Amino acid sequence: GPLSLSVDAFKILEDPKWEFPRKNLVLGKTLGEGEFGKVVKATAFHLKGRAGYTTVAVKMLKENASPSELRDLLSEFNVLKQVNHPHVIKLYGACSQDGPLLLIVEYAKYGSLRGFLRESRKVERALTMGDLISFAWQISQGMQYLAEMKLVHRDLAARNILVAEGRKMKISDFGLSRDVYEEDSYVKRSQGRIPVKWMAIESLFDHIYTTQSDVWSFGVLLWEIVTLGGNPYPGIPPERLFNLLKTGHRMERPDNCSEEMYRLMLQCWKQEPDKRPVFADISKDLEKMMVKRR
Ligand SMILES: Nc1ncnc2[nH]cnc12
Numbered sequence: 001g002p003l004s005l006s007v008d009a010f011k012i013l014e015d016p017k018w019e020f021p022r023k024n025l026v027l028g029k030t031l032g033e034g035e036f037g038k039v040v041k042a043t044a045f046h047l048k049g050r051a052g053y054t055t056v057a058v059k060m061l062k063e064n065a066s067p068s069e070l071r072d073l074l075s076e077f078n079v080l081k082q083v084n085h086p087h088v089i090k091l092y093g094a095c096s097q098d099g100p101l102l103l104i105v106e107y108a109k110y111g112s113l114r115g116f117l118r119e120s121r122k123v124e125r126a127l128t129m130g131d132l133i134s135f136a137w138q139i140s141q142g143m144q145y146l147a148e149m150k151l152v153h154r155d156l157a158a159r160n161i162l163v164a165e166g167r168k169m170k171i172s173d174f175g176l177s178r179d180v181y182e183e184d185s186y187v188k189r190s191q192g193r194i195p196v197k198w199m200a201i202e203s204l205f206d207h208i209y210t211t212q213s214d215v216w217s218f219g220v221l222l223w224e225i226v227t228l229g230g231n232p233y234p235g236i237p238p239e240r241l242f243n244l245l246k247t248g249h250r251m252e253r254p255d256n257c258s259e260e261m262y263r264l265m266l267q268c269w270k271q272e273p274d275k276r277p278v279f280a281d282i283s284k285d286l287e288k289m290m291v292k293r294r
Pocket residue numbers: 031032039057105106107108109110111112162
């Protein structure tokens with residue numbers, strides 16, 4: 001089938017640019033477990049030209065992986081080989097030869113944006129609205145880049161953004177990302193694996209994913225940022241989202257949120273995907289709020 005073809009092709013592809021000697025990689029503590037796989041802290045000796053050890057993160061399959069999970073890891077590898085942006089997690093290499101598939105990626109010392117925000121508060125860690133706006137802007141910059149590359153991320157959420165040295169955002173978790181060069185849309189007959197509460201109305205009902213459904217997810221992400229890692233649609237069961245969204249309901253303006261910021265969220269969640277802003281516009285709106293605050 002499609003996966004068996006991918007695995008065979010992968011196992012023969014002589015890939016000197018990305019292949020890394022397993023013996024030069026030492027794995028450490030678990031940093032997290034996504035639904036497709038797990039990430040562990042690691043160190044790699046003589047990685048891509050750097051003398052000595054470099055601390056990295058390593059993505060691998062969980063125990064008892066399914067074909068779905070294996071497909072997603074292979075896909076993430078294939079996507080990450082083609083992307084290069086300061087706000088997208090960087091790929092360093094892979095170990096594929098004499099053991100389980102390991103992807104070697106950039107380590108982000110602060111962990112997920114969600115965890116970073118929830119440990120904070122607005123003025124443990126002290127964040128200003130300026131900082132919050134900055135975070136969103138960096139993510140929007142990254143997304144503009146991916147959208148230009150005709151990639152749809154599909155799984156944008158604070159748990160999928162990492163925070164690197166200098167509080168720099170890194171979009172991560174490309175296992176569900178898909179190329180839309182030919183049709184500008186990705187459509188799947190089967191039920192998706194993205195959490196319901198982050199999905200655009202047309203993804204939930206019609207299984208259509210585009211850059212403008214990424215924009216909807218960004219609006220949920222914006223809400224998570226503004227609420228310092230709140231839970232979307234709190235107390236509302238996911239099965240209720242079909243009716244709630246189709247009848248035009250959206251999350252209300254949260255506390256410590258300007259009318260301008262809330263307006264941007266609502267715009268991300270317009271029923272009609274064509275009425276939603278593009279990432280370029282999102283970046284311009286955020287930069288504007290940043291300078292108006294000074
Ligand atoms: N690449 C990564 N770097 C740091 N912490 C992480 N948690 C999950 N993935 C991570």
